[PDB]
Amino acid sequence: MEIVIRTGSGDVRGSKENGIAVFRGIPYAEPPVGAHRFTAPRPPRPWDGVRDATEFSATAPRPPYPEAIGALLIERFIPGDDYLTLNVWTPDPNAVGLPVMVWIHGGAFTNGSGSEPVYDGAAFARDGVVFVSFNYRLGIIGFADLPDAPSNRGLLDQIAALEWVRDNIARFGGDPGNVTVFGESAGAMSVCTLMATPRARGLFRRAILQSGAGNMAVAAEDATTIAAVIAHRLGVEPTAAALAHVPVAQLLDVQQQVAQEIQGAPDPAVWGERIAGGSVLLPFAPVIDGELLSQRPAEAIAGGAGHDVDLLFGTTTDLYRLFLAPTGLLPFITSDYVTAHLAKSGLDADAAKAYTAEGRGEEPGDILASIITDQVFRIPALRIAESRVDAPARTFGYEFAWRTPQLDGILGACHAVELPFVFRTLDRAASLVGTNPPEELAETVHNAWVRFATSGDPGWPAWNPETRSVMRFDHPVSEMVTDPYPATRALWDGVPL
Ligand SMILES: O=C(OCCO)c1ccc(C(=O)OCCO)cc1
Ligand SMILES: O=C(O)c1ccc(C(=O)OCCO)cc1
């Protein structure tokens, strides 16, 4: 049962059971404590002997999800400082050249961990894929921009994790030259950001973007504002030099206030006009710092970033219903609010009619959920695909359309429902997908992911602008569809960003 493998920092002891070797909490960066909250990830202090790698490490400091989300997305926090660790599932460390899937968890850059139960890599390892998950720094620590700290520590962490994979995964049976990085939303946005980041060069051959594209970045000037507000509220200077000393509970508290305020209508007196005007989607998304991330990933990708990387991308049909529906308040959303929302994008009120006409929302709240799904996820995803029309690498699209039965079906195919299907961890996701989700669909989706990691082809026609074909996953039927939601898609043709 014990299995000892050499990492670049020393031997680690995992566990091998029923054909799968599992290593949990392999350090890939020194604990980011104090000042090192904000420094670039440091290689773990080498050790002699054998470091235990049987238990997941500490996870990154995160605030609890808002109660609405947190009842559906139940996070597993692991206390401690040594959280820049990764986990490896391999069917056999001695294997030759296994596909490697590196999971970058989502969680809006403030939440998540690589070690969440639903992200268990065993189903991947069972299918002949080396699976790697890891924690990267989150929130203020990961991404608040500071003049005296490298920007985007969380992104640096992901790079360091992928470099660990590059440098170590052959010892776990993986082909470092067949790495598929994949992630959900913030994790997929991270992947897009990595595509756009010179420092991530060559660290992955393929990418699966589950509900995240290249739009999720903080303008440097906004990140500066955000750090200034954070620091002001903490009563310290907006510097790593100051923030290194703030108890993490206080950090997370102010981080949460920033998150909530940016998620709402930011007070211009506190946030300035840009941020009040919505210039920030996620306040701890990667900063367009200029050195690590030179431009928004979507623009980098439009210019060819990641065009050598095979791409599987998709969205959940009703993604944003997760953020509007679970508390039963969608019916209160008004047409005029939706109209005002559409107007923020320069769309007329009757754009809502197109949503209704395509079955994407009867009531304004439903339409709003679909609009936001489009604005933040589906259209950005499609823009990346469109950008890749001439990419040498392949592009495949999916739509995850299976609707969770939770809360009387009000969530539809909402955000995160696809995750246990990808991972075949449906029994760990019942808070979101209910008690009896179709394991067949988990098999279908997961196997497609494995096939894509293995060969760069998930097993269905490639995406192109001609037919815009995506695999629409659902149960009982997952089938190809072409040019889905063409009328709502066209609404966005000329929308800024
Ligand atoms: O609300 C979101 O869009 C931001 C626009 O304001 C949002 C963004 C990212 C995630 C995520 O990373 O989820 C990963 C799965 O746990 C979830 C939600
Ligand atoms: O989709 C997800 O990411 C996700 C969904 C649900 C859960 C969870 O705690 O379920 C517990 C019931 O088995 C965790 C993660």
From Swiss-Prot:
Protein localization: Secreted
pH effect on activity, per entry: Optimum pH is 6 with cyclic PET trimers as substrate (at 60 degrees Celsius).
Reactions this protein catalyses: a carboxylic ester + H2O = an alcohol + a carboxylate + H(+)
Pfam family, one: COesterase
GO cellular component, one term: extracellular region
Principal location: secreted
EC number: 3.1.1.1
Keyword Transmembrane assigned: no
Temperature dependence: Optimum temperature is 60 degrees Celsius with cyclic PET trimers as substrate.
One Gene Ontology MF term: carboxylesterase activity
Keywords noted in UniProt: Hydrolase, Secreted, Serine esterase
Similarity comment: Belongs to the type-B carboxylesterase/lipase family.
Record-given protein name: Carboxylesterase
Organism: Thermobifida fusca
